[PDB]
C-alpha cells in the first residue's frame, strides 16, 4: 500500500508493457497466451491479446480498459497506448521517490499533453493525395512481404493504391463517400502476375449462358436474384381437365408455361441482364431469350450483394417475396452503365461496368498460383486500411516515429522556460516519448539507442516536415526506423490516432497516482 | 508469467528432447521407443504420431510440436516423424549464439532464405520420374514397403497401389493440381486372396453397399444418383398431414404415388435397372420403383455417393422432373456385383470421364487384409506425391548433404548476419545423416567426413549415407528413392516450426 501499491502499479504495468513491446508493428512477435487449461493462443497486436488474456492486478485491470477504449474507437495506436503510460509510471516514481508531489508531475504531464497535441495541430498536412499515406508505393510495399509480390513491388502498389484512394466507388446501399468499405477485387491465378490489371467497374466470376442470348448489353437494367431456378414445382393447379391418360402428363408440365408469363413481367419493370445466384437450365434459359434477356446463372452471392447494394432500387437479392420464381409488381429494378463481356485470365466472364447510383471501381488480380491469391489478400487489407485513414482524416501528420524525437525536442524548450517543478514534469513526459523508436528497433532486431540518437541528430529546428531528411526530421520505417522522406519510404500518421493515445496515457497516469490504499475486510 | 531467454531455452529443451528418441526411430533400420504406462503398459513404436499422442506434454511448445505434426499428417501422413527431427537443431544451434546477441527478426529472414535455396537445390538433384511407367514407380514403393519390412504380398500390392493413384489423377484448381487419394478406395474383404485380384474401373464401394440390392449384374443400364426432391405430395399439390387415418388413407395415397410415378417415368427415359437415392428418399418412392422393375437403394452416406458419382463421372441431379444419360450414368457404364467370400460385392466399372481405377484387396482374413493394407496405405502416399511432383530425390544423406553445402556458399555470398543461421541450418540438415549412423552402428565422425569428401567430387548427387549398410551408397544402385514433394513439405514444415518458436519469448496466462 501507499508507495508499495504505487510500486505494484508500476511493476504490474511494466510486465504488461513488456508483452506489447514484443508485439508492436509488423516486426512485432506472437506471444503464447494461456487462457484455459488446454487452450493457448499465439498472436500479436497486443490490444487484441489483452482481450484474450485475463487480468491479474487492478493495475492490470485498469489498462485493459484503456487499450480497449482505444481499440473500440480506432484500430491504430491500440497497442501503443499501453507502452506510453507505463513509461510515465517509472518516470514519475523516481520524482516521487526524490521529493515530488504526485499531484505536481501529472500536471506537467497533462500540460505537456496539451502542448504535444498543439504540436500535432501545427504538424498537420491535408495534402495526402499524390503524397499518399505512407509513401504511395510503400503503403503496400512493407506490407507486401516480398516473396513473389515484391518483384511487382512498385507495379502492384501503383495500381492497388490509386484504385481505392480518392477515386469513385459506392458504399453500403449507395452512401455518398469514397471507398472505406471492402471492394469487389478478386484474386485468381493464370499465366502471369504482371497481367494483373485495373478494371472500370465490377469483377464477377460467373457461369455465362449460350443458346443465342445477348452477349453484351449497354445501358442494362440489372436483376440481382437471391432465388434459384431450374424448375418451379407444381403438380396441380393448372389444367384440372381429364380426357386421356396423356392429359395427366399434360397437367404436370403446366409448371413450365406459368414461368413464361412471370419472366416477361420481370422484364417489364426493368431488366436487361439477369444475374441469378442459383442455377438456370438451358430449358430455363429459354424463358429469358423468348422474352429477350441476358440471363447469367450461378452468380456468386458475395460479389452480387456488392452489386445489389450498388444497382439502386428494390432488388431481388433483398426481397423475401417468393413464388418459386416471383413476379415484379412496381419499381423493382437495378441499374448499370453497361455490361461488356471480357476475356480476363483467359476466362470469358461478365465484367459489369459501373452501376448507376454511384459508379464504382475494382481490380481483377492475376497470379500464377493459389498462393498468389493468398498473398494479395493481405495486400488488399493493407491498402484499405491506408485509404480509410485518408478519407476520414484528410488532415494527417507526417511521421509517426519521427514526431516522437522532435516532440521531445519540442518539450525540452517547453520545459525550460516554464519555471518550477512543472519543468521536470514536462521533461519526464518527453522521456516517455522516446520508447516508440525504442520498441521498434528491438522488434526490428536493431539497436534502439543508436536509432533514436540518429533521429534527434537530424534537425534544424523542432518541426517535422517533408522538406528534407538530412537537416529536418521526417518519417521512419516499420522495418528500419531510419528517418526518411514521406514519399519514398517514410511514414505518415492520422492526427486522430495520436491525440487519443496521448490523452489516454495521462488519463491512466492520473488515476494510478491517486492509489494509496489496500484496505480490505 | 514467463519471459526472456528462459522461454527461448525452454522452447529449445522441449523441442530437442522430443526429437532425441524419435530420430532413433528413423530409418528402415530404427530403434523403437519404449513407453511405460503408470499402469505398466508398454508401447514399442517408431511412428511419431502414435508417439506424440501418447506422451504427456506440459510445455505448449511441445503441444505445438504435435500441431505441426498434425499439419504434416493431414496433408500427407508420412514424414510426421521427420518434420520434428529437423526443427530441433535449427533452434538448438543458431539461437543461443544469436539471442545472447538478441536479433529475432534476422534469424526469421535467415529462415526465409534457407527455404528457397533448398527449393532450387531440389530441382538440381532430382531427375524426373516416369508417371507413365510402372517400374519407375515400383522401386520407390519398394523403398517404402521395406520401412515396415513387410513384403509378404505387399510386393504385388505395389502394382495395385500405383494402378490406383496414377489412374485417379484428376483434380483441378484452374491449373490441374492433383494431390488426391480420397478418390481412390481400398476393398476390405475377409474372403478370397490378394494375388488373383486386380484394379477395376470406376470407384469401387465397400463402405455401405455389401449386398446385391442394386442388381446381380449390369451390362448396359445406367446408374442414377438422386439428391433431387422425391418427397411426395400429400394434397393435390399441397403438403397436408400424412396417412394416419383411413380418411387420410383413401384421398392422399392416390396423390402419393402420383408424385413418384412422374419421377419414375423421367428415370426410365435413360433405361436404368439400378437407382440409388440419398436425399428425399421415401419408403413408397423406392418400392414403386420395385413395381417399376428397378431395385432401389437408400441408407448410404454422402461420401459414398461422391465416390459413386466419380465411379461413373456423372453429375448428381438436383432436377427431379427431367433426367438424362448426360446427367446421370455418363456413357454406357458397368455394374458388377459378384461373390467374394460370402457377401456380394458391388463393383461399378466403366467410368466415363475416364481414368478412374481403385484398389481391390482381399486377405484370407481381415487381419491378412489389414497388414497388406498398411503397406498399400504408405504406397498410395508415395504415388500421390509422384502425381504432385514427378521428380524423384535420392534418399539417405544424398539429398541432405547436397543442400547443406549450398547454404554455405550462400552464407559466404550474402555474408551479412544471416550467414550464421545458414551454417547452423546446414548442420541441422545433417542430423538425419547423423542418426542413420546410429541406425546402422558405424563411426559417425568418419562417415560424416567422407560424405563431405564425396560432395567435393561427386556433389552427393546420389551418394548418400545408408543406415542399412553404414556406407555412402549409390541411391541409384540401391533403389532408395522418394519424390521431391514429400522432401519439400517435410522441410517446409520444419521451417514453419523454427520461425514459430522464435517468435515465442513470452508464455503468460
Swiss-Prot record, chain A:
Catalysis: reaction(s): ATP + H2O = ADP + phosphate + H(+)
Cellular component aspect of the GO annotation: acrosomal vesicle; cell body; centrosome; chaperonin-containing T-complex; cytosol; extracellular exosome; Golgi apparatus; heterochromatin
Gene3D superfamilies: GroEL (3.50.7.10), GroEL-like equatorial domain (1.10.560.10), TCP-1-like chaperonin intermediate domain (3.30.260.10)
UniProt-annotated binding residues for ATP: 25, 77-79
Residues annotated with N6-acetyllysine modification: 187, 388, 482
Entry's family note: Belongs to the TCP-1 chaperonin family.
General function of this protein: Component of the chaperonin-containing T-complex (TRiC), a molecular chaperone complex that assists the folding of actin, tubulin and other proteins upon ATP hydrolysis. The TRiC complex mediates the folding of WRAP53/TCAB1, thereby regulating telomere maintenance. As part of the TRiC complex may play a role in the assembly of BBSome, a complex involved in ciliogenesis regulating transports vesicles to the cilia.
Protein name: T-complex protein 1 subunit alpha
UniProtKB/Swiss-Prot annotation, chain B:
Annotated positions binding Mg(2+): 78
Matching CDD domains: TCP1_gamma
Sites bearing Phosphotyrosine, chain numbering: 232
GO CC annotation terms, alphabetical: cell body; chaperonin-containing T-complex; cytoskeleton; cytosol; extracellular exosome; microtubule; zona pellucida receptor complex
GO MF annotations, alphabetized: ATP binding; ATP hydrolysis activity; ATP-dependent protein folding chaperone; protein folding chaperone; RNA binding; unfolded protein binding
Reactions that this protein is recorded to catalyse: ATP + H2O = ADP + phosphate + H(+)
Cystine pairs: 351-357
Residues annotated with Phosphothreonine modification: 415, 444
Function: Component of the chaperonin-containing T-complex (TRiC), a molecular chaperone complex that assists the folding of actin, tubulin and other proteins upon ATP hydrolysis. The TRiC complex mediates the folding of WRAP53/TCAB1, thereby regulating telomere maintenance. As part of the TRiC complex may play a role in the assembly of BBSome, a complex involved in ciliogenesis regulating transports vesicles to the cilia.
Family: Belongs to the TCP-1 chaperonin family.
Protein name: T-complex protein 1 subunit gamma
Natural source organism: Homo sapiens
Lineage: Eukaryota, Metazoa, Chordata, Craniata, Vertebrata
Gene (name only): CCT3
